[PDB]
Structure 1
């Protein structure tokens, strides 16, 4: 980490230089504005200690210069006694915190550490989000059945009640839930996808609801749960039919009161989370067999979206295939432009029991083994029909 100190006071300045020097942080100093601007033009800094009062320039201008160029640089303004208004103005202008010249070295340490933590937290947030953005995909709804399902999704998006998405696996259930959140008034809020079937039943509740210290053996400290962390957002539970009966009851409560207890808790907690659920099974049968609460089935089933197989929407097949063609043609550095005229026929003729997920895997393999500029019916031969 690099720090830039812009102070005129040889005393206070040195104190700063020393402190930073002691913590193992690279430092550079500037006695005046013209020198600070020079350095600021040659080196990127993580933290800048700026004194609002400088001989040749008005500190505030430097702060403004810094904030326009690199908002990622934490900036701490330095001001004297009784100059709190400008410090507050400075902060309103983008300064993170401020130091009063003079002050305890402990104040210097705490203020600088607070700024360092913010930066740490800020970078982590950016990285995880940018990493997530890399995986963003664009969807295809060119079939009548889907074209209208899209419209219904637009109508239910801003509702606060739950949606139950059904259909054969690999049909696009999670995709639909993503759009529901994307088109809703919560879109900028978190979207959490949790597959109930793949997460260990014995860990699921602790993760969804969170737990207090000692609620179960192993629980050394207290941990928040997805419901809390996703507060204000949307929670998507895939394969809802695999929820334990114990878990089903707790879920019905949140859907009813938006309140719940952590495992081993006494304080009731409230959250505002839209719940979206999906299943590729027969829940009605699950209710009869007494494995799935009928009440929950009724509530989740208020708004229901049914996604039909790929077989029942051939208008989607080719478009989706082209989408995947391009996608993988990139990921794997290959020269596949499109599909042979006959190859397209095979695609349309196949039943795609795996549906879109199958369609995806097939094209990805076809593209990975592709030699020419096109994919023949023969290249789909070994892969499907």
Structure 2
């Protein structure tokens, strides 16, 4: 029930399918909320590992202190690791997919780590002396400008080219007019079901406005305004008037 219509978005769909069997890093770019996450989840579904686990992880929320430990895991004992060994996120994602959103926020200390992972697929647990090898597909995404961040010295160049093999840039919504209404209608149908309203579709007078709004919030802001509209809707159709005060 996901929407891909515009040529640019349709092109991505084909591109994704071609790499479904690929075991190599992917870097997703675009403004935040252009559906980069859906793309990441889609790659998992269309691959041969689709039946395997899909691990979603926020890398920012991870404390710098335990970062290495929580990712790669740790063995029993070994620096206050209690009496028990515990797996890391990579091992949990073994054979599956690991998705890093907002990867662009990471300490240079931490960025340098994981470097040796991507290509070699090998690492050591904290305090473990036995090398472990795992099979993991790495996916990364950011709403930032990756190209510039390297130049500003906030991101290591050497890491970019490993991750920057394949790059899919979801363009902003304002340049996708064809994808506006189809998305807008789908959400209406969705929110109408959860909140249980009588609403169906949009007036043409309203339809023109949605087109002429250059969506700085992309498809998220879009999803949100409708949720407001559906709640404040009265009749079976939503006019420009109800949205006029909203935009």
Instruction: Compute the RMSD of aligned alpha carbons.
Output: 1.8
Offset at residue 248 of structure 1 (A)? 2.1
Offset at residue 288 of structure 1 (A)? 2.4
Greater CA deviation, 245-254 or 338-347? 245-254
Give every structure 1 segment of 4 or more consecutive aligned residues whose post-TM-superposition deviation is greater than 6 Å: none
Offset at residue 223 of structure 1 (A)? 1.9
- C-alpha contact (below 8 Å) 1:260/1:269 kept by paired residues: yes
Offset at residue 169 of structure 1 (A)? 0.5
Q: Which has the higher contact order (CA 8 A, sep 6+)?
A: 2
**For 1:278, what is the secondary structure of its paired residue?**
strand
- C-alpha contact (below 8 Å) 1:238/1:278 kept by paired residues: yes
Q: Structure 1 residues 353, 179: CA separation in 2 closer, same or farther (over 3 Å shift)?
A: same
Q: Structure 1 residues 332, 143: CA separation in 2 closer, same or farther (over 3 Å shift)?
A: same
- C-alpha contact (below 8 Å) 2:74/2:81 kept by paired residues: no
User: What is the aligned length?
Assistant: 247
> Which protein is richer in helix relative to its size?
1
Q: Structure 1 residues 300, 375: CA separation in 2 closer, same or farther (over 3 Å shift)?
A: same
Deviations 1:77-134 (A, max 9, x none): xxxxxxxxxxxxxxxxxxxxxxxxxxxxxxxxxxxxxxxxxxxxxxxxxxxxxxxxxx
Greater CA deviation, 221-230 or 350-359? 221-230
CA distance in 2, matches of 1:203, 1:228: 16
**For 1:265, what is the secondary structure of its paired residue?**
coil
Q: Structure 1 residues 215, 366: CA separation in 2 closer, same or farther (over 3 Å shift)?
A: farther
TM-score under structure 2 normalisation?
0.93
CA distance in 1, matches of 2:245, 2:6: 28
Q: Which runs of 5+ in 2 are unaligned?
A: none
Offset at residue 203 of structure 1 (A)? 4.4
Q: Structure 1 residues 221, 321: CA separation in 2 closer, same or farther (over 3 Å shift)?
A: same
Q: Structure 1 residues 264, 347: CA separation in 2 closer, same or farther (over 3 Å shift)?
A: farther
CA distance in 2, matches of 1:263, 1:246: 16
Residue 272 in structure 1 maps to residue 117 in structure 2: no
